[PDB]
Design a protein around this ligand. Sequence first.
Ligand SMILES: *[C@](O)(CO)[C@@H]1CCCN1C(=O)[C@@H]1CCC=C1C(=O)NCc1ccccc1
Length: 710
Amino acid sequence: MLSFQYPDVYRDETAIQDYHGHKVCDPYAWLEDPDSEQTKAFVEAQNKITVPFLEQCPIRGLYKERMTELYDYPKYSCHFKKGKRYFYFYNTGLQNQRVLYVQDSLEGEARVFLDPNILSDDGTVALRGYAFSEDGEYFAYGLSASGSDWVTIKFMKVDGAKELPDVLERVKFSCMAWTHDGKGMFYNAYPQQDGKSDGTETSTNLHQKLYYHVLGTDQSEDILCAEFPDEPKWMGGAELSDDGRYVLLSIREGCDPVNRLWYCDLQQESNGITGILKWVKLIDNFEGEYDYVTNEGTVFTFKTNRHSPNYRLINIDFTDPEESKWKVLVPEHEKDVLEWVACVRSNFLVLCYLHDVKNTLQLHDLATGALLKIFPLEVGSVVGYSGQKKDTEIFYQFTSFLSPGIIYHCDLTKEELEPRVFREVTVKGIDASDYQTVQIFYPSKDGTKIPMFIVHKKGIKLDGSHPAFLYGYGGFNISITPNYSVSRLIFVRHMGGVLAVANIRGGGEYGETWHKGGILANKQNCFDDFQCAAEYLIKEGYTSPKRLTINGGSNGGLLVATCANQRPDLFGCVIAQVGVMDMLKFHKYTIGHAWTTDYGCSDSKQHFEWLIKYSPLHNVKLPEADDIQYPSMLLLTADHDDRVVPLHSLKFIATLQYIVGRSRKQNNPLLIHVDTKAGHGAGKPTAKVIEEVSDMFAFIARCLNIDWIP
Ligand SMILES: *[C@](O)(CO)[C@@H]1CCCN1C(=O)[C@@H]1CCC=C1C(=O)NCc1ccccc1
């Protein structure tokens, strides 16, 4: 099968670093420089063998045509009201970017408000963040180029959709919050740095500042409102209270769901916003999360995890702020995670729970916390919502494995609340009733029961004959909940596949204890959980190792890369997207310093000892048994991935090809594809998304010799 040879790649054998007495060799350290001729030649040589491999089999074309056909369905966000007008996002089917529409009433004719498609030939300029002024008359929006986290904020007057002159540069990981006087907007920016700031650089991002931009002025005139020069990793994001009276500052350091919470009573500023604000340090530590829900005068309602791993709602009165005085408005549930909370129609709260990895949605009274209404939902996820304090109605969007889903509307001025289907779209080509989703709970190595969703054609024999696609993430308190994926359903219908999603530790599915169960010293739980998921699928007859594919992205790319090293015998195929591979150096680049709350940091002797054991880059090793080789592997990355700098995948594939790819017994390919004008994944145009899934499933089809089923 291997009709190509791996490129020559220089090994710098002098690259030796001491980590607490452990010598680590890093012969591909030079691939850390994205700008060198050496690195560019490496990328070109790798793509030169990967692309013809992927495109040799007719199956890529059949997949791509079927993806193009089935992905072509209308896609809407929830309606949301701002001031006098309604807005929603909409893609007719195959537009590169969804388009923002405005209408003057729910029954009124809609018109294009902001169309990102006209900003590039190839749809690689994408909306990233936006905020309307309190009165709905002005609009700020972030644009990112080529998938980079870097943002340029531009502005529009809503009436007439008029471009304004204001442009804000050096924006990254930014809040956008307008003061209610409509004078201007808070946002974050980074100090100048040497070299590039376009998504191709690896430079660390430190000293993020909070600024205020007065509409109608140059950026050079913006007011510095908060900075933390003694704490270069702190990130202070601003929002206005619902009554416009307070600026709330949430300071983060790292990725843990915790924040300091400072406030500024704007009425108490000596002369409006003119410099560093008179911050009152209400919560001045990182012991808990405090997510603002609403306030009534000085009584502030927050979603918190303080003393409550599954989250709860508390009231903190700013005039009596000590923790012993806080009121518990909605107590923590013993098992279900309070995922998010919104305040709507003055005195309702909308609460969204995660119950065994499925969403529920409930209306509660603001004053007492009492449950008033359950909004009935099928099993799946709530993935969109609108309705803020002043609004008198809600929209919410539901999705699941087997249907694109439904947008509901509920008029909250009615005595008897009755949600109605507002929009529903059918995907002709996939009959949902041919398939089923089951949820099982399998024991991991230590006996912990892990949830797994399995999706497959009805009536299949569990004889181990089926190809399977097993997906995981396992980190950063992120819950992996049901979602509609055309690309995965084509695998099921046209490749005869079984789909599986394992809810491994590290995620947020069972609250903070689930998260803590897959971080730091215990990160190996994630890999154990995921290996156990594969073993369960095999034992129960859904699949066999030779027909099993695993996939994950980012922290999920680490997951699958590590599982390949640790259990090469368990998997036939591995696709690792935009993965963190160098666990010893991840913290040196761009925003990687923020992930040490999940992983630890190699500067620490204790953390190094955890990290060295599973770092994919440092654990490539020929399997001992003559009958065992590495699975076929595909790494996907891109040249403007400034979230997880591509050096991770570059160094990892060089190592795989040298240590494993050169052995006689290795016949499974070990490949990387590096895309151009693309980044970590957010804002990826439709055309690239289609090419990407076509690459992935063609890879699977070719490595496992799977026949297309028309
Ligand atoms: C991927 O897993 C997912 O994109 C990468 C690699 C490890 C974690 N990760 C992230 O993107 C983390 C997960 C959740 C948010 C992340 C992040 O780095 N966000 C940027 C950011 C913004 C504000 C404060 C801290 C970090």
